């Protein structure tokens, strides 16, 4: 049984192989870290080497026992095939990661939509990223379906933008409307004065002619302004003598 | 008939070759589950080895029964994607499961939202989750759906806020609202006192003045605390002389 | 023509082969079955054997007559390859068969929806699963359409949940109303005593206050008991004096 | 030029190939209408022996002309690929034609609904179903979307259920409507009386207490049974006492 | 400079091989248009064997010139995969092309909807469908997407069928409203006498008590039926007394 | 280092290959255009030949460096692989494009609805096209979009429909709406009289009976002729005695 | 072991191979550059050129260490094949970039619609587009998703055109309500006299006479012409005497 030293002299291969591919690799992603690439597309682009180098091991090795070469390039061709199909959605998703945390077109602690669903980032992770709705629910989104989706970043910009809608009866003095809210905005200090200030009749409604009114302000300030105008406008408006209308109706009668 | 000699030969191959397989592939996956990996992970990586090396006995051994290499890379191939086809969904389902529990972000127990549907998860099993409807209905979902659909969590985060919308008529004291409902909150020992405490004029609406009421609690709390936050604004409003408005209406007569 | 000898050869090999092939299947899927494996499972891994087999045989007996060998794997597969297209849609349906039918997230005569619809489920076939809608009409779905759907089954679970939304005036009494609806669940003897048992003021509406009352039953009771308690909600608080408010105005005239 | 020989000897194979191929086929498609199997499975299965046939004769005759046999794999590989493309909707709607046929899940003559569309079946053809709208309509839908959509199926079952459901008003007699509806239904002798009988006040509604009646006739009955039912609890209700009542407003007047 | 008389022959076998190409071929759809089969399924099926043809004669022209075969079926494989690409939806059209017109379950001048859309079509053509919409826009559909989506033809029944909603108001006979619509459609002639005739009480409604009235007609008199019997409805019921109710409204006076 | 006059060799087969190739496909294109068959076609099915022909330079150059020619055909497997993925929505515009060129389903100038959106047509260009909305909106649609969806072509029709809907009281005369209408169809000289002239009680409606007018007029006059003709019935019915009625109302009063 | 030389030769092989490959790529790209056709393109057409090289020098100088040729097409094959998974939305990210900066359907600065979300633009990067919403938000569109949308883009056009729609009471002279519109956009200067200027009647509307003003303005004055426009029409309106008018209702009284 001369003939059973290739046994032992594929193991050997195997042990070799192992190694060799173990070192070089660690190798190879030591080099790439020390330029800059990426952590992950180091390990992942590195890791490819790896299994590259025990995919030849393996062919050579199993070889020596008469395991015909085109038949090694088939099984693990059908091996890798169908770890790939199980993985994919990983490896879609793991790729995202890098983008997003290589682009950061949203950083943790922004306020963001991601494709419908909203809120506070927390954390990018491998396949999936978490977010706190403003109401505390957590919510975990594929890092695959957010690459591919629109990004609505609410925070990145520091500057934001309000727009009050207010109606008023058809009966107002629109010069008088417009006084009272331009002189409401004019005071307001967290207005920034040197953008935006629009205050405008801009529809003509149902049963209420509408205003609109649009200016600017911090992003930290926008909510807070929103609610400070508006309870001044309330207050304005029935002080001066300017009313919110209720639904109108003219009813036609008749006696039948 | 001396070249039926090797009909015997290709069945010592199965059998040897079926022992060999065996025994590789138990003791692969005695190793990987030592180290940690995962139960199912290590099975599945584990059973590809089986199923890997067993592929090599069969070229072998019809091999020695002129069966042409190739056709039988050729006739396996085939099989395993005619398998490949049918299995799939399965394989993509059961990737999924071992996702969901080696990273939690729903556990047994807490009540998520799965895209559309909402309940009580029970189990997170090889292909399908089981949740529990707050009104008694089983729903089975696919783990492969989950995991590459957004996961909502109600349960994770410790504490959690309601969002009251209460209407007032217009000619109602603007200070007087907010004073009811922060006193109303402010003695509610369930809110959490040290987080948002948002009482504010909202919206000027079809019929009534909306007033927003925002405050957090642990999230055991959050269902009674809104209950009797509500049973109490309706009744001191009531003694207080405020009133919630019916949809109102200025109809303007016209005999005709 | 003693080169006409290889024909009959040919044929030789086709039915000895046939045999072969028919009589390994045969006695591989006997083993299956005797271990426990899935009586269909079974018939298709075999099968596979039996197609696999003949495809063999028919490779080493075209051989013999001069037919390439790598021309028959190419037929062959392009003759697979259109079959595999013309059946799928089956051979999916086909597993997902086997699915349910070893899962029974729903059995037979269990209520449950679909994916939209929903009906009493009869009987799960290879291909197609058959239930009867409450009133009478026969729906057939696709075993593979239901797999990859969310399965709600409104039967498996024991105990189940009514919730009624009672409307009442707003110048009702709170206390009153909750007494009331809490004395009729509290008497009726279908509704389990030891679960929820929720009677609360739940929202301040258009022109109703609306209570929220949600009691657990037995499964069976659920129906019965919602008909029976509201009945009796409607008399009681008819005798009471609580009224049911209907749609709500206030008219504000104006002579013009 | 005596290797223009090789020419004639091409043909030769050719003739003598599309024979023995034509004679193949036919007697195998002779054996498998014997056995049962289904008309057109044979007559494909058939047609796909055939052209293998002849795929065969074409490569071992353009062979015996120098034309390197791995390029008549490749070329014939091309054009069956490329008639693969154009047909396979066809292949699709074929092998739906088949199983629509062979399972019945409706027959010609059954009303249908298949998805969205509904009519009464007329035909099943190679390609797509014909069916008429009650109205007058046809519609011709491809066997394939047929197959992979829900089928509902108006007609198999012997047996269906009308619901009636009538709103009367608030302060009508809830013993009395029951007794009325209930004595309807005991008369009318084409409601199954061994069957479901549901007289019960079901919805607190807007403006109107909703009764729900549910009764079961044969399939026939189900239209007449509604009609002739609805046009008797009109004149019952009428001549007893009990209002149908127009939507209902309660309007709170205020001069101005 | 022996060695460059093959550039020479491989020219002969260029202009030899796409003669030679070109007689086959429509050598071959001589004979299928001679059968019957198709002018479009001959001219398809043909221009493959002539591009196949002229495939082998680029094999062996370019291989006398020392272009290793298997490269030519490499380079021509990538190519006619680029063209593949480019076309497809065209080959899917044109084949719904063929079975549009060997099919005609719409033909040129049919009133029919295709998905949405719906005109009198026009003419058939290679890719696409045009159709007229009743009011003079020209809708240019894709074959394809006609094939594969629902076809509802409103033309090809000869015999079609009205329905009338009639809503009268709740105090009107109901016998009276039978007899005069059933008097109206007795004794219009257009209406198919030995066909359905329902004339009954359909609907407790809103604020109508509404009656369904169908009867069947010849596809052309459809519309005017319609209409003509309508006008009818309304003169007569007027004449007649019977009231069109306008909406009702039960309002509930509340002097505050 | 005379086998380093194999890299020299190498060089001379690329430039004349690159030559040979450029001077080809030149050639082939001058053939193509000279025919007739399509500018973009032609420069497309040529730039494969110049590319096919320097593959081929490409195996057999490199070939003479010892890079084993099957590594040639991988490795610009590849990059024409990773190539045509970049590309292709590319190449499936660069078709619709000559499509729509070579077909003017719609023409520059024409104003056409391309699934939602609906514009006058400038420009298609090799991937996208570009329409102009009524108000002047730029739009780019893709080439390949446009091709896969209806186009629906509001002007290539020559003469085009107006429905007016015009709803009158109930107690106005039938006959004489009927007459007011007609006559003032008939005097509007762009409505052409040889065709469609529907006058008709249309719909019993909510509180208005309902007449539809259709009339065809050129494509030009359509806009102006209803509009024209709107003001007449508005202006004729007025002066005539007949009321566009407001929405109606039967309320019956309740003191409580 | 004068057979590990060819360790010693690998290495060299991959060193030489990574330099000539690393300067023709470099010399490539530097030719494509000094044409025009596009840095990106360039780099990326360069960069396979670049990896095509160490691709052959790695199956070279493995196949001197005994590394079987093909098994490094294989092993490479599935290495790129992993790399092409993870990328790919990438790669048809990045080639959309190109495509939108070298057609600049929208420029930098220009207000677009880009499927359903519309800002102002502000760079067209790598793989995704950035742009601001009127608003303050900022949206990340990848490039892909834009390519293969519509592109509705405000600002190319250099005049755009407001439509106002004014309802007025049905008893409001047509005339006068004409020449009133007509005479204020005839006074605005901002509005462009040469184009479009339609004033007319366009809907007999539920509760008013509704008339449809058009006019064409520099796309710059478009918003403001709009308002001020309005505020016009408005006071102008009033001062001649022309009612904007409340919903309209007939109450048709009924004691009971």
Redesign the interface.
């Known amino acids: 049984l001369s003939y059973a030293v290739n046994i032992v002299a594929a193991l050997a291969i195997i042990i070799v192989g192992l190694i060799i591919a173990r070192m070089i690799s660690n190798a190879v992603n030591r080099l790439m870290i020390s330029r800059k690439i990426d952590a992950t597309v180091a390990d ?1 682009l590195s890791a ?1 080497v790896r299994y ?1 180098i025990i ?2 091991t393996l ?2 090795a ?2 020596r026992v ?15 095939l ?11 998703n ?3 990661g890098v ?1 997003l945390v290589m ?1 950061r ?1 949203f950083r943790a602690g922004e306020y963001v939509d991601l494709g419908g ?1 909203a809120g506070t980032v927390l954390s990018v992770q491998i ?2 990223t978490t977010m ?1 709705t ?9 890092n ?2 957010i ?8 925070s ?2 520091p ?3 309000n ?1 009050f809608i ?2 008023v009866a ?1 009966d107002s003095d ?1 010069d008088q409307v417009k006084q009272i809210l331009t002189n409401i905005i004019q005071s307001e200090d967290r207005i920034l004065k040197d953008r935006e200030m629009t205050v ?3 529809e ?1 409604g ?2 209420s ?1 509408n205003f609109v009114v649009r200016v ?1 302000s911090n ?1 930290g300030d926008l909510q807070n302004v929103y ?1 400070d105008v ?2 001044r ?3 304005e408006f029935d002080a001066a003598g300017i009313s ?13």
């Open positions: 992942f490819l590259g995919a030849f062919i050579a199993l070889g008469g395991v015909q070469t085109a038949s090694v390039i088939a099984v693990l061709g059908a091996a890798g169908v770890v790939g199909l199980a993985l994919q959605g990983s490896l879609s793991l790729a995202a983008l682009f077109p669903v396949f999936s706190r403003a109401d505390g629910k957590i919510i975990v989104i594929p695959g379906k690459i591919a989706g629109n990004i609505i970043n609410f990145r910009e500057v934001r933008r727009e207010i109606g058809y629109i405008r009749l801009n003509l149902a049963s002619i600017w992003s609610w508006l309870e406008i309330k207050r919110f209308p209720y639904p109108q109706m003219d009813v036609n009668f008749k006696r039948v």
